[PDB]
Design a binder for these strands. Sequence first.
RNA 1: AUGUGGAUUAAUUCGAUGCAACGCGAAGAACCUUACCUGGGUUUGACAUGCACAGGACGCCGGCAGAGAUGUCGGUUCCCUUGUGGCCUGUGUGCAGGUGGUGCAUGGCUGUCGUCAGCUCGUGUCGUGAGAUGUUGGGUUAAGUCCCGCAACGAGCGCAACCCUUGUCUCAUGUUGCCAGCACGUUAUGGUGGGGACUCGUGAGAGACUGCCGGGGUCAACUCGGAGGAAGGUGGGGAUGACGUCAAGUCAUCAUGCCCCUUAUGUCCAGGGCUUCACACAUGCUACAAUGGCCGGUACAAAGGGCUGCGAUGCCGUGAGGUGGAGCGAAUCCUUUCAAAGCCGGUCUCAGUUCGGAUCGGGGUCUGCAACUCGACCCCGUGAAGUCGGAGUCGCUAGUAAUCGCAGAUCAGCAACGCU
Lengths: 126, 11, 103, 99, 155, 82, 100, 208
Amino acid sequence: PIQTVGRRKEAVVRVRLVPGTGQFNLDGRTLENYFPNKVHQQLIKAPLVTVDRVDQFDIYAHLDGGGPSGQAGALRLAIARALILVQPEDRPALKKAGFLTRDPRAIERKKYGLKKARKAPQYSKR
Amino acid sequence: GQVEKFRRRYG
Amino acid sequence: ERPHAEVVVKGRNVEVPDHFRTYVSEKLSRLERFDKTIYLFDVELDHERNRRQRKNCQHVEITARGRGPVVRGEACADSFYTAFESAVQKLEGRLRRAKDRRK
Amino acid sequence: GQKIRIRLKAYDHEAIDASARKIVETVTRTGASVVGPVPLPTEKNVYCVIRSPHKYKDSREHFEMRTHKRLIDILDPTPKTVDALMRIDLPASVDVNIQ
Amino acid sequence: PRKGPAPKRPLVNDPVYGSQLVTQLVNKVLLEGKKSLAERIVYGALEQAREKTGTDPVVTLKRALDNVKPALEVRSRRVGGATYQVPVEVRPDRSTTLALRWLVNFSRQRREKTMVERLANEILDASNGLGASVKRREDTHKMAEANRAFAHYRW
Amino acid sequence: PRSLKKGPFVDDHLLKKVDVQNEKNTKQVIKTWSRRSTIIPDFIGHTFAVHDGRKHVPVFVTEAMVGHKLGEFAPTRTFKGH
Amino acid sequence: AKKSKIVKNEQRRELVQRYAERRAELKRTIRDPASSPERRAAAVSALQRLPRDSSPVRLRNRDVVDGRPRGHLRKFGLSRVRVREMAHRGELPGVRKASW
Amino acid sequence: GQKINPHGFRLGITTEWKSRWYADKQYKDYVKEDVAIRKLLATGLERAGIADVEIERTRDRVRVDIHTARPGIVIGRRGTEADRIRADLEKLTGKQVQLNILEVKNPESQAQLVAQGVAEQLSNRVAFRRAMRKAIQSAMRQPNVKGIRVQCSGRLGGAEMSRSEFYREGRVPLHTLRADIDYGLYEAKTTFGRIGVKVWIYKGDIVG
RNA sequence: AUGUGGAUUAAUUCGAUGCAACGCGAAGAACCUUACCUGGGUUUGACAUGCACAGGACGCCGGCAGAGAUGUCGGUUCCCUUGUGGCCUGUGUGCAGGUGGUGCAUGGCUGUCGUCAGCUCGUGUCGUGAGAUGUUGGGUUAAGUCCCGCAACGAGCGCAACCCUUGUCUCAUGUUGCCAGCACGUUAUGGUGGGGACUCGUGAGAGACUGCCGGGGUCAACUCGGAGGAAGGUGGGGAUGACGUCAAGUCAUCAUGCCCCUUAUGUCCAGGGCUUCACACAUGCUACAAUGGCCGGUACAAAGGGCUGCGAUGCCGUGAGGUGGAGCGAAUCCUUUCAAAGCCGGUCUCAGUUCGGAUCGGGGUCUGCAACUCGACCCCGUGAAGUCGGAGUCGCUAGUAAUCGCAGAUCAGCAACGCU
């Protein structure tokens, strides 16, 4: 079977990319009852746009961790990786698009001497 | 003023 | 802005006769005379009270606000009068220089 | 079957590893069933301070007293094997929960 | 950047329209992370314009942008006892950007009871050539005319 | 405040003093150090002296002063203006 | 800080072990329900007759040797300064400077 | 405050602890016990130099090892000193006292002991060049002694200014983690006031 | 709301003073704390430890006096083997104690210029000598990083790297966690047997090195474009603070050289204050509204903490909370199967309002011996100033800023909007 993974700032989701319809399952619901946000829909669908394979591969996945945006990014990453596993030849037009890079923009440690990461207090010269 | 009733509520 | 010079008289631990206050306010008016840009004058009158001292009994820190650049004059002497006058003359150098570079 | 669950605690992974190996060797002697060192997560107790006295709170220093942990589920409790396992002496950075 | 600049961010295309100035628009009207609120405001306003004009709002939007987008602006400098303003040409990137900034910040102080309406009416007004955005752009050109004298600086 | 179920704080020392005074059925000036005692209407004729960190102040009790602590009527801080 | 108040904190802990064990707690067990003699208990008054040092409220967790009475750490029974120094000398179980 | 303890900075990486156990609830107790132990050690013996104090705990027993280059001055030849200390251990509640004394090989390659010898020389009556320089040479003549530093402070010969000047030879890479280091400190008697001492010894590097 | 200055004040403990003091010492001032003030008692003392001498009890349990300190009666009137030991009763004796002063006598410890790239030595020559050269000149560098040169050859502390964390991947891996293929409960549900399959958690380890393609370059450094790769050119963030200055700060974290006290500057106590207020300053929070307020319905996170502690199931109370205790020394249970901003729906229609919440009068809850001075929370009523803010000024280059919420510790309970 097919089983692969994606991750974006504490947004893990496993993916079963079935060869069926474009019917999406997200823990017992669909891409419009979960994620009522067309931008997230676009991010999730753009690999299907890229290979022109909308309504060719069903999905079964589990929501875990992160929020909506991290979940969407990890999802499309995992879908891209599943497509590489189905066939490599689409790869050189994907890293071309960067639908494969695991977004290394994670949170910064809140530091001391501050109010948070970088916003210092109001520096008076008094 | 109603202290007879204050110390019926307070006992 | 003439009484707007925010006087701040103060001494951590000194016998402060209230005619020193007259001295301080007058010597600070003296520079109100030729700088009309003044908001704040935080001032101290400090005393190290060490035994067998190193020639420097009293101490003073002075800082002043101007429109942007702040001024800083520190001094040290045996008593109140040299302290006042010396910090005054250092401020005078600062402020002559500041109003020479202002234009 | 009958089960026995040993939960180990310590501060040094080197010691928890060495002791786990020695213990599982002793279990292996009498043919008693081993599950092995199933890794639990770690604890991270943290206690922030200030470095210096009387002021300078902006300067700080952090510390972290972790506690590594391991579960070793042992089965087939032959009481001879129990008599073997109960009485091993180990490094002192380890404490054990035989239950 | 004493050592050198760095790249610009790769704007996305719109899922609905096919234009990245619209994602630029939502990201310039955004306030306190409510990107989806910006999105729904903008889409509602543009569809209000659609029912106002019977056509796509994007064309009238870019026409308003053609009205309010300068290619010349000011850039000051302190010189010889009296600070001088100077005309400087403006590349199209910052032209569009500052135009949109004008557009939003002079939209906010209108009286349509609601941002979506204020914004939509401002866009229509600028397509027509009436908005305070256009007014300020004309003031900018007025200033450049008053200070053509300082172009030989070439800076 | 001192909730209902607990009952008030009427401390035992001056409780004993007032038991003495009302068993004798005569009322005299009394000196006490207890701001923290709340009031019963048993004290209305009684007279208390109470401390201000510095000295005492004899003060007479009244009906409507109940529900209060005596330190409400002992001034702690002198302030005279500037 | 002062040997006097260090001794006094110790002594208050001992008085606690005497009386707050049972004689300053069973009266709370009296005073919790609705079936109490609070109507006529005066267990409140007998508690007032017990000392003030009955309570742990009058305690103060001082550092076990130095007695810096503020900046206490209950994981160690020590103050921030000695804690620095001895963690810093490597004299504590599994204690080290950290990162994350 | 510039420079942290190299021991405390490399503690979990290169160097190691000096009081090993595990404990969840007896922790405060073990700490007050251990401070009382080290205090009574210093108070029970001072003619000799304790390099370290280290050993551990279990369900019942409370063991110690301890380092000093001159145990002959310390321990009861017949058992006097060790018995007084086992009694001190009974008093402060050890009750199973495996006081297993040990001694070092190279006392000159020990930071704490070199600093204690130096401070002894200072508190005797003595000046600074020959003591300092001769400790430096005594260390550097040995094989693993690949570097050294000394940072004395106090009022040498040369009335009242708190002067401090250092001496060194070899390598002292204190921002380098593969390095092994030994730190050495002292703070005790002298006529005018206190004298303080810090010492660094360098002993190869470590790859593991 | 906090912290200072200033004046009151009986006492408003003490220190902190530009950058580097002023949500500082405070990671918890109702008493305690607390060093301060009134009054009381006390004085080899609240505390140790050493002497000789008288002792066989010390104490401990209940009472009355008492603001308590403290004082007074009844009960226990020890075990060593007789030499006198544990103990204290006292006698004084060595004394013990000091938050009494000097951080400009000091150690330590720290902040700082500054995480800015420099600071120095040996031998060597030059110079009468102070001293210089080396470390200057050309290129390049995150940079005294490196190269081409020469009276300099080299070298050490430094910068960089070995550390952790995050970022991809392989091997092993199966509970307290995944649970696909399976089976069985089916309303609360991975709930239970069952599979290590994806996660996963913890451990070991390859992987990034201008390593490679090409163009420039003393052909040297070095840089400009490419491939792959997850990341590309000190991947990012931390930690790490050269010599040293600032007589920086700290004799109150501690320890300490000197001088002062000792019938009291010590010491045991109850009350009060450190929360005062005609004002000024500095740091922040919620507001000045429609990107909004109100009501209703629905979804996904990580992280930590928990025993004489955490606490729900059922119900009552408007709700603070209230008896009750399952279950947990804990990926199990409490931590809702861990939230809020957000999505959807309805009303409000630009206003001193369904803004805003202060201030104040009520009535109650909880922790504590104790809520007046001087605590938090809840309900009711109260409904103020305030309509985006002057000169000038602070912060921020990427998951950063801006915003919503949560958690922890110090904590009996709280000023926690603070801190991490």
